[PDB]
Scaffold this active site. Structure first.
Site, PDB file in Angstrom:
ATOM      1  N   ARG A 110       0.857  -1.182   0.000  1.00  0.00           N
ATOM      2  CA  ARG A 110       0.000   0.000   0.000  1.00  0.00           C
ATOM      3  C   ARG A 110       0.884   1.220   0.000  1.00  0.00           C
ATOM      4  O   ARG A 110       2.019   1.194   0.500  1.00  0.00           O
ATOM      5  CB  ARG A 110      -0.907   0.043   1.229  1.00  0.00           C
TER       6      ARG A 110
ATOM      7  N   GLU B 151      -2.661  -0.631  11.954  1.00  0.00           N
ATOM      8  CA  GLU B 151      -2.734  -0.492  10.486  1.00  0.00           C
ATOM      9  C   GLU B 151      -2.807   1.012  10.135  1.00  0.00           C
ATOM     10  O   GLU B 151      -2.574   1.412   8.999  1.00  0.00           O
ATOM     11  CB  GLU B 151      -3.975  -1.241   9.947  1.00  0.00           C
TER      12      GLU B 151
ATOM     13  N   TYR C 242      -8.969  -8.649   8.193  1.00  0.00           N
ATOM     14  CA  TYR C 242      -8.510  -8.224   6.886  1.00  0.00           C
ATOM     15  C   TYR C 242      -8.523  -9.435   5.951  1.00  0.00           C
ATOM     16  O   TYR C 242      -8.611 -10.598   6.382  1.00  0.00           O
ATOM     17  CB  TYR C 242      -7.078  -7.655   6.974  1.00  0.00           C
TER      18      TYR C 242
ATOM     19  N   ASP D 219      -6.519  -9.390  13.043  1.00  0.00           N
ATOM     20  CA  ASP D 219      -5.317  -8.639  13.407  1.00  0.00           C
ATOM     21  C   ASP D 219      -5.561  -8.342  14.885  1.00  0.00           C
ATOM     22  O   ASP D 219      -6.016  -7.252  15.257  1.00  0.00           O
ATOM     23  CB  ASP D 219      -5.205  -7.350  12.566  1.00  0.00           C
TER      24      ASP D 219
ATOM     25  N   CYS E  34       1.266 -17.261  11.764  1.00  0.00           N
ATOM     26  CA  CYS E  34       2.359 -16.401  11.344  1.00  0.00           C
ATOM     27  C   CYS E  34       2.694 -15.619  12.597  1.00  0.00           C
ATOM     28  O   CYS E  34       1.788 -15.200  13.310  1.00  0.00           O
ATOM     29  CB  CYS E  34       1.887 -15.405  10.259  1.00  0.00           C
TER      30      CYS E  34
ATOM     31  N   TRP F 168       5.110  -4.042  10.263  1.00  0.00           N
ATOM     32  CA  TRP F 168       4.529  -4.695   9.072  1.00  0.00           C
ATOM     33  C   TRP F 168       5.497  -4.269   7.961  1.00  0.00           C
ATOM     34  O   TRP F 168       5.303  -3.257   7.286  1.00  0.00           O
ATOM     35  CB  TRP F 168       3.134  -4.136   8.796  1.00  0.00           C
TER      36      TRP F 168
ATOM     37  N   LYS G 136       6.222  -4.924   2.813  1.00  0.00           N
ATOM     38  CA  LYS G 136       6.098  -3.928   1.762  1.00  0.00           C
ATOM     39  C   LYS G 136       7.376  -3.107   1.597  1.00  0.00           C
ATOM     40  O   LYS G 136       7.589  -2.491   0.560  1.00  0.00           O
ATOM     41  CB  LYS G 136       4.921  -2.985   2.082  1.00  0.00           C
TER      42      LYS G 136
HETATM   43  C1  FAD Z   1       2.658 -12.571  10.706  1.00  0.00           C
HETATM   44  C2  FAD Z   1       2.107 -11.499   9.707  1.00  0.00           C
HETATM   45  C3  FAD Z   1       3.004 -10.521   9.154  1.00  0.00           C
HETATM   46  C4  FAD Z   1       2.604  -9.552   8.206  1.00  0.00           C
HETATM   47  C5  FAD Z   1       1.239  -9.562   7.768  1.00  0.00           C
HETATM   48  C6  FAD Z   1       0.340 -10.494   8.336  1.00  0.00           C
HETATM   49  C7  FAD Z   1       0.750 -11.432   9.298  1.00  0.00           C
HETATM   50  C8  FAD Z   1      -0.308 -12.390   9.856  1.00  0.00           C
HETATM   51  N1  FAD Z   1       0.793  -8.704   6.771  1.00  0.00           N
HETATM   52  C9  FAD Z   1       1.697  -7.794   6.230  1.00  0.00           C
HETATM   53  C10 FAD Z   1       1.279  -7.029   5.127  1.00  0.00           C
HETATM   54  O1  FAD Z   1       0.160  -7.134   4.588  1.00  0.00           O
HETATM   55  N2  FAD Z   1       2.196  -6.137   4.635  1.00  0.00           N
HETATM   56  C11 FAD Z   1       3.482  -5.950   5.206  1.00  0.00           C
HETATM   57  O2  FAD Z   1       4.198  -5.060   4.705  1.00  0.00           O
HETATM   58  N3  FAD Z   1       3.929  -6.775   6.165  1.00  0.00           N
HETATM   59  C12 FAD Z   1       3.048  -7.666   6.645  1.00  0.00           C
HETATM   60  N4  FAD Z   1       3.485  -8.570   7.661  1.00  0.00           N
HETATM   61  C13 FAD Z   1       4.884  -8.450   8.117  1.00  0.00           C
HETATM   62  C14 FAD Z   1       5.970  -9.123   7.337  1.00  0.00           C
HETATM   63  O3  FAD Z   1       5.534 -10.486   7.051  1.00  0.00           O
HETATM   64  C15 FAD Z   1       7.213  -9.153   8.182  1.00  0.00           C
HETATM   65  O4  FAD Z   1       7.561  -7.836   8.510  1.00  0.00           O
HETATM   66  C16 FAD Z   1       8.391  -9.787   7.435  1.00  0.00           C
HETATM   67  O5  FAD Z   1       8.044 -11.104   7.015  1.00  0.00           O
HETATM   68  C17 FAD Z   1       9.591  -9.835   8.344  1.00  0.00           C
HETATM   69  O6  FAD Z   1      10.695 -10.444   7.657  1.00  0.00           O
HETATM   70  P1  FAD Z   1      12.047 -10.672   8.470  1.00  0.00           P
HETATM   71  O7  FAD Z   1      13.086 -11.043   7.489  1.00  0.00           O
HETATM   72  O8  FAD Z   1      12.305  -9.456   9.300  1.00  0.00           O
HETATM   73  O9  FAD Z   1      11.739 -11.841   9.512  1.00  0.00           O
HETATM   74  P2  FAD Z   1      11.535 -13.418   9.427  1.00  0.00           P
HETATM   75  O10 FAD Z   1      10.842 -13.786   8.168  1.00  0.00           O
HETATM   76  O11 FAD Z   1      10.959 -13.846  10.722  1.00  0.00           O
HETATM   77  O12 FAD Z   1      13.003 -13.985   9.291  1.00  0.00           O
HETATM   78  C18 FAD Z   1      14.019 -13.876  10.296  1.00  0.00           C
HETATM   79  C19 FAD Z   1      14.797 -15.080  10.143  1.00  0.00           C
HETATM   80  O13 FAD Z   1      15.779 -15.132  11.222  1.00  0.00           O
HETATM   81  C20 FAD Z   1      15.979 -16.488  11.536  1.00  0.00           C
HETATM   82  N5  FAD Z   1      16.673 -16.502  12.821  1.00  0.00           N
HETATM   83  C21 FAD Z   1      16.145 -16.174  14.069  1.00  0.00           C
HETATM   84  N6  FAD Z   1      17.027 -16.251  15.067  1.00  0.00           N
HETATM   85  C22 FAD Z   1      18.202 -16.651  14.464  1.00  0.00           C
HETATM   86  C23 FAD Z   1      19.532 -16.906  14.979  1.00  0.00           C
HETATM   87  N7  FAD Z   1      19.840 -16.744  16.290  1.00  0.00           N
HETATM   88  N8  FAD Z   1      20.503 -17.308  14.110  1.00  0.00           N
HETATM   89  C24 FAD Z   1      20.169 -17.467  12.780  1.00  0.00           C
HETATM   90  N9  FAD Z   1      18.957 -17.218  12.207  1.00  0.00           N
HETATM   91  C25 FAD Z   1      17.995 -16.824  13.088  1.00  0.00           C
HETATM   92  C26 FAD Z   1      14.527 -16.964  11.528  1.00  0.00           C
HETATM   93  O14 FAD Z   1      14.744 -19.144  11.341  1.00  0.00           O
HETATM   94  C27 FAD Z   1      13.979 -16.340  10.258  1.00  0.00           C
HETATM   95  O15 FAD Z   1      13.980 -17.189   9.101  1.00  0.00           O
END
Ligand code: FAD
Length: 383
Positions: A51, A99, A256, A274, A319, A353, A356
């Protein structure tokens, strides 16, 4: 082994960061505890909302500068990642939610000359299929908003990062970080590394690494339910939609959903609540199974208000949402300079969030990890 930058976390933010660091000619290592593309963190599912509109002016400026970054990424991977199905916001126009707020946002769109159609309850019900809405519910449709192909974006970033020379290592969890005047020592369950700077992009696990350094960020983790529903009544127009409502004593009362993903087969749509309730003490407490009460609330609301979908879910999942505890803040993005000595050596993306903003946050974390500063205005997002 030593690297200019070590990225902790291989989700979308970590991969975008690694791609940008590597493309700029620096040595980068990404450490991921599970596997790349895993569905156990904050990036499970097929779709996210793109958005332009935001209640905060600074974030609205950032979405406008992120749009060209998405187009550049789409051209690099030769795949349309954003599908402009529309962004529909409606409900109580004054309630403030994670939001945003409808009235405040409409004022911002006018100010930035962003187009939108204002709609009354009857209009929302006629055009989109909703039913039984309180008569005073109003909202707007912003036509340039839409749905983001999550899995297509991840595949693109992974491929781009590896092609640029980033070292992507899965199945390795970072257990300790110790910054000093000369760099940062990174300890994992597999070995040890030295990094010029470290980017923490580990979602709900950020505090595990910041705690022993005497720091802790004010965010909460929520295991949110998501479900897929069969579309019963053929569509007219089916934008992304978010229903803004006053909370109830038991939950946030926000819902949503998305129109059908244009890249997927069949006729299923995803919807969810949410609800900022029942935060987890630790992400390890996640069950991975949709909460019964949240599901009952979602299906119940859909049953009464969006008859275009069949109220009995075909699939459900979860999630992990990570959001600032303080409603006045939307994101934690910057360095740990003001949280600990040598903190400027730790770049952190830690709540909000953000899907995006993946193209932008990757570029900003890359700027901070290589050259002490960025051209983008993110002063308010500082941790
Ligand atoms: C849950 C959710 C999020 C969401 C959303 C609806 C829901 C139900 N709707 C959104 C939307 O419409 N528009 C938007 O812009 N964002 C929206 N979100 C949020 C978005 O999904 C999150 O902001 C984004 O996915 C975050 O990504 P990020 O890369 O920051 O995080 P992650 O996917 O959790 O990955 C982190 C990785 O780190 C690994 N990890 C954790 N600890 C360690 C250590 N110690 N060592 C090594 N790796 C580690 C995690 O296995 C993970 O893969």
């Amino acid at each position: 082994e030593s690297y200019d930058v070590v990225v902790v976390g291989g989700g979308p933010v970590g991969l975008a960061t690694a791609w940008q660091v590597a493309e700029r000619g620096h040595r980068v290592l990404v450490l991921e505890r599970h596997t790349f593309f895993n569905e156990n963190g904050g990036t499970s599912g097929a779709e996210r909302h793109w958005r332009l509109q935001y209640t905060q002016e600074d974030l609205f400026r950032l979405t406008l500068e992120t749009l060209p970054l998405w187009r550049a990424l789409e051209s690099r991977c030769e795949r349309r990642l954003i599908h402009e199905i529309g962004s529909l916001w409606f409900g109580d126009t004054d309630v403030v939610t994670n939001e945003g707020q409808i009235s405040g946002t409409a004022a911002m769109m006018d100010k930035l000359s962003v187009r939108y159609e204002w709609l009354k309850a009857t209009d929302i019900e006629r055009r989109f299929g909703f039913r039984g809405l309180p008569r005073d519910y109003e909202g707007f449709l912003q036509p340039d908003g839409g749905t983001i192909d999550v899995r297509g974006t991840l595949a693109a970033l992974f491929t781009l990062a590896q092609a640029a020379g980033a070292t992507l290592r899965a199945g390795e969890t970072v257990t300790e970080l110790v910054p000093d005047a000369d760099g940062v020592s990174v300890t994992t369950d597999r070995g040890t590394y030295r990094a010029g700077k470290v980017v923490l992009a580990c979602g709900p696990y950020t505090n595990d690494l910041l705690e022993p350094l005497g720091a802790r960020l004010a965010y909460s983790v929520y295991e949110m339910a998501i479900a897929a529903y069969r579309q019963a009544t053929p569509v007219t127009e089916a934008p992304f939609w978010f229903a803004f409502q006053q909370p109830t004593p038991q939950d946030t009362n926000l819902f949503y959903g998305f129109g059908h993903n244009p890249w997927a087969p069949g006729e299923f749509v995803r919807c969810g609540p949410d609800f900022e309730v029942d935060p987890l003490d630790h992400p390890s407490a996640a069950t991975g199974v949709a909460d019964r009460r949240q599901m009952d609330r979602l299906s119940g609301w859909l049953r009464d208000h969006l008859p275009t979908v069949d109220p009995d879910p075909v699939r459900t999942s979860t999630c992990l949402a990570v959001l600032p505890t303080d409603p006045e803040r939307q994101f934690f993005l910057g360095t740990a300079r003001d949280l600990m000595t040598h903190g400027e050596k730790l770049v952190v993306y830690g709540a909000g969030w953000a899907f995006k903003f993946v193209p932008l946050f990757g570029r900003i974390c890359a700027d901070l990890a290589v050259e002490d500063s960025t051209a983008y205005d993110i002063s308010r997002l500082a941790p």
